[PDB]
Amino acid sequence: IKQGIREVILCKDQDGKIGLRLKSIDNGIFVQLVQANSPASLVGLRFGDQVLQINGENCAGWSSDKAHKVLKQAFGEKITMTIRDRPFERTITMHKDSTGHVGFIFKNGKITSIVKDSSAARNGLLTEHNICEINGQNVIGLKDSQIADILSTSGTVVTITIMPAFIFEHIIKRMAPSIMKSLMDHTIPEV
Ligand SMILES: CNS(=O)(=O)Cc1cc(C)on1
Numbered sequence: 001i002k003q004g005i006r007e008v009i010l011c012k013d014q015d016g017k018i019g020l021r022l023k024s025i026d027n028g029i030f031v032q033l034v035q036a037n038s039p040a041s042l043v044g045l046r047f048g049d050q051v052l053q054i055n056g057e058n059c060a061g062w063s064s065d066k067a068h069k070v071l072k073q074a075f076g077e078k079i080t081m082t083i084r085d086r087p088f089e090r091t092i093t094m095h096k097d098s099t100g101h102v103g104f105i106f107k108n109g110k111i112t113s114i115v116k117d118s119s120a121a122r123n124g125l126l127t128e129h130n131i132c133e134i135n136g137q138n139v140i141g142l143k144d145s146q147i148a149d150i151l152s153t154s155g156t157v158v159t160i161t162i163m164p165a166f167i168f169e170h171i172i173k174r175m176a177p178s179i180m181k182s183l184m185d186h187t188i189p190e191v
Helices: 039-043 064-072 144-152 165-171 178-184
Strands: 005-010 018-023 030-033 050-054 078-085 089-097 104-107 108-115 129-134 157-164
Touching: 005 039, 005 129, 018 064, 030 064, 050 064, 064 078, 064 089, 064 104, 104 144, 157 165
Parallel strands: none
Antiparallel strands: 005 078, 018 030, 030 050, 050 078, 089 157, 104 108, 108 129, 129 157
16 A cells, blocks of 8 residues: 555557456545456556546546546547555555464455454454455455465465455445456566
């Protein structure tokens, strides 16, 4: 969660795509899906990110639909965006013990308990929070087993980005878990 507003410059691909779906939330506009191998994944857009401006025009109060139209009607050449970094999320750094545990239970990407005298507990991890990212990789809609795999194959230090479930549920409104398994970019960023 980078403290402030940054600017990104996008460029439609050969197919006129940027790779983005956006959701209206509390009169802001927020990133709902980022597509693998897309302009939006290259420039580093993330689920949860707020779009402040599109080409210098303010997004406040737009509907998802208007946001999507604005994007279609734009000269592919160069689309600027003003981004606030994942405003609804926090990042929690934890350390695995010698058993390789951090100390929580989660179900359907949702944390549901903290284990006494874990790092998770020492670190104030919260239940009723959806796991958005692990070690900077988006994990939304992967099966629980594959999240365990990512935690299990991780270094000792584990960084998790979480979002209040009521907010999370508002963003992904009416989506299958396997929709986002398919569509959401789950790669480590290129350098
Ligand atoms: C895969 N379909 S989508 O338009 O790209 C994102 C979305 C929004 C809602 C509601 O359900 N899915």
